[PDB]
Design an enzyme around this catalytic site. Structure first.
Site: not given
Ligand SMILES: [Ca+2]
Lengths: 223, 63
Positions: A40, A52, A54, A57, A62, A84, A172, A174-175, A177-178
């Site tokens: 999804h 990563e 933060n 910034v 990275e 999924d 967990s 939203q944000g 996912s995965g």
């Protein structure tokens, strides 16, 4: 992640952020060239961001690498959320170091009661929204298949599991996912769905990675 | 009435149960405008468009 804690810089070196102008999903690095995420989360233009902490910034060390291919499981059903899972190929290999490292695939399924680490840059509130600068972590156990199906009657397939706390407070969100669900240093789960977040009797539901190892290996081989 | 724009446009935002943050657009009846939100990636409702234009066209007139 609701009810979790600040991971600390690069303590989860396999966590990645998927960027389409903004962070939309997480992902797990499984080797120098491949990331596992949720189906999804599929998007045609993705930039993978590795190493990563933060995400708001750019520190300068990275690795930001375009995805050359995003391959959703061919049996993914967007209504049931069965299968999924998606694999993302990097345009170029990441440089592995102490801050960017791959996570192993499972060599067996994890049992009820096993402690996992779930991580991501998602909502840290159960009411309203707050998105953190830095990576958040949660320790949570795998729940029994019986208690998962009780929570979500008619929704849990064979390729799903539940983890977290039936009392609420820690999930967990939203944000996330995965992103990864790691038990004994293996990738056992992918953040997928739940009814709200950190609510009573509505634990997190996760894709069961142990079911897809054959598909993962053959996708990587053939692409 | 059928094909009724109000049946879509007047629905509250629904992030749904999946855990992504995908930029979408919805009609907000209190501002009478197409606004952005972050969709979770599955389910939700029909007040959920890929672009401001799509929303603006869909919700051009509400009865
Ligand atoms: Ca950064």
């Amino acid at each position: 992640i609701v009810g979790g804690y600040t991971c600390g810089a690069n303590t989860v070196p396999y966590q990645v952020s998927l960027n389409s102008g903004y962070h939309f999903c997480g992902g797990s690095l499984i080797n120098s060239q491949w990331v596992v995420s949720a189906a999804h989360c599929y998007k045609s233009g993705i930039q993978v961001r590795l190493g990563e902490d933060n995400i708001n910034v750019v520190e300068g060390n990275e690795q930001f690498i375009s995805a050359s291919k995003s391959i959703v499981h061919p049996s993914y059903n967007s209504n049931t959320l069965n299968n999924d899972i998606m694999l993302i190929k990097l345009k170029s290999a990441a440089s592995l170091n102490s801050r960017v490292a791959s996570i192993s695939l499972p060599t067996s399924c994890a049992s009820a009661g096993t402690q996992c680490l779930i991580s991501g840059w998602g909502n840290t509130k159960s009411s309203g929204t707050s998105y953190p600068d830095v990576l958040k972590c949660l320790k949570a156990p795998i729940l029994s298949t019986s208690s998962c199906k009780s929570a979500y009657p008619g929704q849990i397939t064979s390729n799903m599991f539940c983890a977290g706390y039936l009392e609420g407070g820690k999930d967990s969100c939203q944000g996330d996912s995965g992103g990864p669900v790691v038990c004994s240093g293996k990738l056992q789960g992918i953040v997928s769905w739940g009814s709200g977040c950190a609510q009573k009797n509505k634990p997190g539901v996760y894709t069961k990675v142990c079911n897809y190892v054959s598909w993962i290996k053959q996708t990587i081989a053939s692409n | 009435p059928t094909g009724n724009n109000a049946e879509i446009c007047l629905l509250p935002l629904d992030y749904g149960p999946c855990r992504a943050l995908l930029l979408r657009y919805y009609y907000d009846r209190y501002t009478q405008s197409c606004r952005q939100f972050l969709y979770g990636g599955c389910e939700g409702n029909a007040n959920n468009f890929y672009t401001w234009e799509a929303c603006d066209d869909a919700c051009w007139r509400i009865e």
